Amino acid sequence: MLEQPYLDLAKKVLDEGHFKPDRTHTGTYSIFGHQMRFDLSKGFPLLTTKKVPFGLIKSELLWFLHGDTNIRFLLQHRNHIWDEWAFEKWVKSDEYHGPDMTDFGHRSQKDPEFAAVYHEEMAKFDDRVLHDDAFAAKYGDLGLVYGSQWRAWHTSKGDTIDQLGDVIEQIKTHPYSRALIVSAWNPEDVPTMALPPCHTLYQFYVNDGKLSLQLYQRSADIFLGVPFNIASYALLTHLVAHECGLEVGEFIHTFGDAHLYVNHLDQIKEQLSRTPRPAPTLQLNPDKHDIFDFDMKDIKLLNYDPYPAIKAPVAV
Amino acid sequence: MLEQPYLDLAKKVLDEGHFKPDRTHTGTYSIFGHQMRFDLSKGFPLLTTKKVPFGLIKSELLWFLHGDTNIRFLLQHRNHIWDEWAFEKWVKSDEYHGPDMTDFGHRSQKDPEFAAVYHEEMAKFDDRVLHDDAFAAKYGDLGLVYGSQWRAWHTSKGDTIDQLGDVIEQIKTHPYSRALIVSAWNPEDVPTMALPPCHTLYQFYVNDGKLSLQLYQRSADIFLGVPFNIASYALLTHLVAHECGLEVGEFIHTFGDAHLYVNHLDQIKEQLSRTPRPAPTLQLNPDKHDIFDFDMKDIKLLNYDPYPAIKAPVAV
After folding, report:
1. Cβ-contact B58, B78 below 8 angstroms
2. Which of A313, B24, B73, B107 has a CA positioned 20 to 30 A from the CA of residue A127?
3. In a 3-state reduction of DSSP, which class is residue A307?
4. Mutate which of B25, B182, B188, B259 to test chain A, going by most A C-beta atoms within 10 A?
5. Of A183, A212, A218, which is closest to B179 when you measure between CB atoms?
6. How many CB pairs under 8 A join A and B?
7. What span, in angstroms and rounded, lies between the C-alpha atoms of A137 and B296?
8. Distance between CA A46 and CA A290 in Å, rounded?
9. Does residue A181 sit at the B interface (CB-CB below 8 Å)?
10. Closest residue to B32, CB basis, from A154, A205, A218
11. Do B156 and A156 make contact, defined as CB atoms within 8 angstroms?
């Protein structure tokens, strides 16, 4: 089936993965150097072996395409993927007036009412970002995120480069270019960044009227992150193809450090006992063509009949 | 044998490669997305199926490690790999006074005495770069090359970042970091660059006391470039390991567009009829440890018994 490369990744990490201590005190089994490809003409690579929130993938990607770096857009779509990063900055601000929250991440998973107080403050934060325009501007703007890196790379002249916009331009005018690359890695920001881009860079490639993309991911969470990561870029591939009047080719996923957290072993094992079902199909708004102006309703997912979702503790 | 991954690449491009027009009017058979790994503990991956100039690989890499961007160093080592780029700038300079030379590249391969005049002027250029310090400074400095990108990345403050120096620092202090990355891709320079970096970025990785490296190459010339490309990075891996007091792991080569030029078909076919021999071994100066201060004599190649060299026309 279409998602086999993923399941094979999970299998391989379990059999050949070597224990490796990471940024957190919850071990990982890891491998270095891996590549898998998905033929987008066969279907959309959204895991059927477990329910994955396509809505979240769609909203986050549109956020990226808009060159947006403010969490407000995500909150307006019931998408809380980046909340922690904004909250992090808010709590450490000289304007924060509430319970400590030092290292909220680690502490939330082990404390009773603390997690309740944390959730309470987070709820306030979200509501504030949503209604106080001044607040959203100061604490809702993450600054250096994919949207900014893809569409507003800061130069030395003080100007900004719309990498993605320029590459799409290059695809239409020079489809046979071997430099259709967009990088999210900036050496001058990386030394002092909470989390340097995981999705380091990607490259488009046109052949026989088909568009393909290769993503180089430096670090990946096999269980929780990868299923989303695959969907995000396979979707990107479709959108860019859609705008450039091309058909979809393949999505090539290359990994640096691919790792599985120990507290996910049982969860990955049970998923491996499920049999994949036919992959879903993706439909895009035929009339709309400027993917940058795309909206939620312009992307439709069809025939997605997955197995129930699998819950697993996050690494913090 | 150790070099099989290379031969398998050549085979695959011949069987599955699709014709693709490139920057030059000499077609190519190409594939997109490929990865091969070499276990450096088994030997040094220098092709035995054809004689490859290790001396050139060694000198060019030391040039890189020194953060050098001036061709003079290369000329002082009988290494002419980058001459064309410097010459290009020289000829187009308001100080050049000699035969036209417009598009010397394309024209040299098809003309009789023109190639002789070209060679004549190039010889003068080299001699000049070698003796006139003022000349070498103006036309010998390529500026934006690997040495500069690796060790003197220009920031917005006007300062420079020694990426490689910092990463080696990170390897010693945080070997388990999943961000040991060095990028050669700068979005603000790329739009106006003669040849944007082919070797886009690389990542180091430590596990069980072994150091490994993955290189993401956006474009590769299967026949002429790859054999050198493999050696350069396998060597880099050894040097960094040598400085960080680690053993060597694997060299992982990932490709974007891997292509074979049509005027190399017969040459690659004949090489595929040769049987690989035992791989050579690499020996490094035991006393020296600051790889940045390394010199030619500090790197020794042993037991390299290759087949004769294969000549093939370059793509220009």
Report:
1. no
2. A313
3. coil
4. B188
5. A218
6. 129
7. 56
8. 24
9. yes
10. A205
11. yes
Nearest to A13 by CA among A206, A227, A277, A261: A261
- Count CA within 13 A, CB hemisphere, residue B237: 33
A12 touches chain B (CB under 8 A): no
Structure token pair of residue A151: 């569409």
Alpha-helix residue ranges (DSSP H) falling in A244-276: 265-271
User: To which residue do tokens 């900014």 refer?
Assistant: A148
A291 CA to centre of own chain: 18
By DSSP bridging, strand B247-261 and strand B210-221 are: parallel
Q: Which two tokens stand for residue A146?
A: 């994919």
Number of residues in chain B? 316
* Gap between the Cα atoms of B204 and B199, Å rounded: 14
DSSP B278: P
**CA–CA gap between residue B18 and residue B259 (Å, rounded):** 9
Q: At what angle do helices B54-65 and B226-243 cross, to 10 degrees?
A: 50
Name the token pair of B304. Answer: 């390299």
Beta-bridge partner residues of A37: A252
Going by DSSP bridges, is the β-strand pair A153-154/A160-161 parallel, antiparallel, or unpaired? antiparallel
CB–CB contact A154 B156 (8 Å): yes
| Closest CA–CA distance from residue A176 to any residue of chain B (Å) | 7
- Other Cβ atoms closer than 10 A to B127: 12
A203: which chain B residues are within 8 Å (Cβ-Cβ)?
218, 256
**SS3 state of residue B82:** coil
In chain B, residues with a C-beta closer than 8 Å to the C-beta of A166 are 191
CA distance B306 to B302: 12
Exposure class string for B61-71: b at 16+ Cβ within 10 A, else e: bbbbbbbbbbb
- For residue B301, give every residue at least 6 positions away whose Cβ sits within 8 Å of its Cβ, in sequence order, or none: B44, B46, B54, B280, B281, B282, B283
**Amino acid code (one letter) for B75:** L
Q: Between the CA of residue A14 and those of A209, A222, A265, what are the distances in Å?
A: 38, 11, 8
- How far is Cα A261 from Cα A256, in angstroms, rounded to an integer? 16
Bridge partners (DSSP) of residue B261 are B28
AA identity, residue B34: H
Task: Give resolution, Å, one decimal.
Answer: 2.5
Give CA angle at B219 (B214, B221), nearest 5°: 105
Closest CA to A16 of A30, A2, A36: A30
Sheet containing strand B181-183, strands side by side = B18-20, B28-39, B247-261, B210-221, B199-207, B181-183
Method: X-ray
Domains and CATH numbers, chain A: 1-316 (3.30.572.10)
